[PDB]
Amino acid sequence: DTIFGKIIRKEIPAKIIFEDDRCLAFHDISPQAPTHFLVIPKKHISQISVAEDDDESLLGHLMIVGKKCAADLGLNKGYRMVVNEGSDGGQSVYHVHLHVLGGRQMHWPPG
Amino acid sequence: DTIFGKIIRKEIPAKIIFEDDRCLAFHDISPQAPTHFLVIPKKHISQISVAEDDDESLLGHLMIVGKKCAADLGLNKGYRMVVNEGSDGGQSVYHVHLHVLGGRQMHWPPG
Ligand SMILES: Nc1ncnc2c1ncn2[C@@H]1O[C@H](COP(=O)(O)O)[C@@H](O)[C@H]1O
Ligand SMILES: Nc1ncnc2c1ncn2[C@@H]1O[C@H](COP(=O)(O)O)[C@@H](O)[C@H]1O
């Protein structure tokens, strides 16, 4: 499985900051902002380009959970959510997940 | 209302590339990649930090629609999805929406 499949299975280390029946979140190992964490679904979907219609609620859930965690972490000034798809998107781990970055002014373009 | 509220109402111009009962998509007026479009929900939510639990499916829908449009537009090499929240996130239009950027290698950090 992937790195995230292993974190879910408690095979690869990660301090978990949120978890429910459908997802969990943890800090990015290479933070690009003072606060930089990921929200990953327990269900395995290799990439968003292959997600099904029926996964919409799960995908929206990752955003609602990212919003909640951002609040818990004190990101009252805003943040940026990001989903990296495929080679051009810069995807490294083929298990769908969402990035949330804050604690500093995010720039434009977004990469 | 906002710029996007007006586009929905057909008050501000935009070539619409996709539309269903719950959202529509159109190209960004200041493209940061060869393909750069937005997916916006017809329902008004000023920012994702104020979205409710009950909006998860709508939020996931924006991603599924972004995936479909990306395929329609030929982004077979991947892309990046982005949601700008608040001042630090770089948010300009206070009507929740999703960016989809492709057609070139996206860099890291994502701003
Ligand atoms: N063991 C790990 N724990 C936490 N974050 C990680 C770990 N391995 C990879 N990452 C992060 O996960 C992301 C994978 O890239 P992407 O698929 O583009 O989101 C990069 O931002 C890596 O820093
Ligand atoms: N009239 C318009 N038509 C299309 N895109 C627009 C228009 N007005 C603003 N935008 C884009 O919408 C985005 C608003 O910023 P943000 O809230 O950070 O996504 C920027 O990328 C602008 O280029």
Curated annotation (Swiss-Prot), chains A, B:
Keywords per UniProt: Acetylation, Apoptosis, Cytoplasm, Disease variant, Hydrolase, Neuropathy, Nucleotide-binding, Nucleus, Phosphoprotein, Protease, Thiol protease, Transcription, Transcription regulation, Ubl conjugation pathway
Q: Name one GO cellular component term.
A: cytoskeleton
Q: What is the effect of changing residue 69 to R?
A: In NMAN; negligible protein expression due to post-translational degradation; no effect on homodimerization; no effect on adenosine 5'-monophosphoramidase; no effect on affinity for tryptamine adenosine phosphoramidate; loss of SUMO-specific isopeptidase activity
Record note on what altering residue 36 to R does: In NMAN; no mutant protein is detected due to post-translational degradation; no effect on SUMO-specific isopeptidase activity
Per UniProt, AMP binds at 28-29, 84, 90-92, 97-99
Record PTM N6-acetyllysine, positions in chain: 6, 15
Per UniProt, subcellular location reads as: Cytoplasm; Nucleus
Q: Name one GO biological process term.
A: positive regulation of calcium-mediated signaling
Q: Which Gene Ontology MF annotations are present? A: adenosine 5'-monophosphoramidase activity; deSUMOylase activity; hydrolase activity; nucleotide binding; protein kinase C binding
Q: Does the keyword Isomerase apply?
A: no
What outcome is documented for mutating residue 29 to F in this protein? Approximately 10-fold increased affinity for tryptamine adenosine phosphoramidate
Q: What does this protein do?
A: Exhibits adenosine 5'-monophosphoramidase activity, hydrolyzing purine nucleotide phosphoramidates with a single phosphate group such as adenosine 5'monophosphoramidate (AMP-NH2) to yield AMP and NH2. Hydrolyzes adenosine 5'monophosphomorpholidate (AMP-morpholidate) and guanosine 5'monophosphomorpholidate (GMP-morpholidate). Hydrolyzes lysyl-AMP (AMP-N-epsilon-(N-alpha-acetyl lysine methyl ester)) generated by lysine tRNA ligase, as well as Met-AMP, His-AMP and Asp-AMP, lysyl-GMP (GMP-N-epsilon-(N-alpha-acetyl lysine methyl ester)) and AMP-N-alanine methyl ester.
Q: Which family does it belong to?
A: Belongs to the HINT family.
Q: What is this protein called?
A: Adenosine 5'-monophosphoramidase HINT1
Task: Give the species.
Answer: Homo sapiens
